[PDB]
């Protein structure tokens, strides 16, 4: 099949072996309710010494700044939130991405294919990075509709399930030690 599934563990040792993390969070984390163990999960993996931080598109979510809003909320320090724009030059240098109910937002046919419906608008250029993880629960299309390239690409796997499933389980894993 075109796509790669990985399991938790997979996802897991991902998370150990990278030094460097971007989240890059779209509608599909807050549908969810995934901003309180995502919090939790960053704030421990900061405690590991790695680098974490949040990269969020000026349009993701429903609402303008709706992701910015419910990360403070729940307790994300602003300090580690950061604008596409200020943000964008890293992916290359990013061993880790985790894309969390993102699509549009992460959408390398904006780049890639000049008859796009989303041609020339701009994405975060997360398939840049070394490793790619995607978090939604199927491969199927976000408000634009359309289909987005970097879930077949070479380093992206996907993680399929629902974001608050899958994020309080790898805060439990990772609260393990
Ligand atoms: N921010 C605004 O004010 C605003 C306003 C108007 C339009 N828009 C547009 O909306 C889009 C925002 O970009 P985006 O990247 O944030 O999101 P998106 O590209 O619209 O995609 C969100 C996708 O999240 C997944 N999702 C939904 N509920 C989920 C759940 N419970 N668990 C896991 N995944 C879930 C769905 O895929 P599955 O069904 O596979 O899970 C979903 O594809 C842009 O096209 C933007 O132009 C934004």
């Excluded at 549908?31 to 590991?48: G, R």
């Excluded at 796009?116 to 634009?144: D, N, T």
């Amino acid at each position: 099949g075109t796509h790669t599934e990985i399991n938790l563990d997979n996802a897991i040792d991902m998370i150990r072996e990278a030094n460097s993390i971007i989240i890059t969070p779209g509608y599909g984390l807050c549908a969810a309710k995934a901003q309180y163990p995502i919090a939790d999960l960053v704030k421990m993996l900061s405690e590991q010494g790695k680098k974490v931080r949040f990269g969020i598109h000026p349009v993701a979510g429903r609402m303008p700044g709706q992701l910015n809003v419910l990360l403070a909320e729940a307790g994300v320090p602003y300090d580690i939130v950061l604008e596409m724009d200020e943000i964008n030059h890293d992916f290359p240098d990013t061993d880790l991405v985790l894309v969390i109910g993102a699509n549009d937002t992460v959408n390398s046919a904006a780049q890639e294919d000049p008859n796009s419906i989303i041609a020339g608008m701009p994405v975060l250029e997360v398939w840049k990075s070394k490793q790619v993880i995607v978090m939604k629960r199927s491969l199927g299309v976000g408000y634009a509709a359309v289909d987005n390239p970097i879930f077949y690409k070479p380093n992206t796997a996907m993680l399929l399930g629902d974001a608050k499933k899958t994020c309080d389980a790898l805060q439990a894993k990772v609260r393990e030690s």
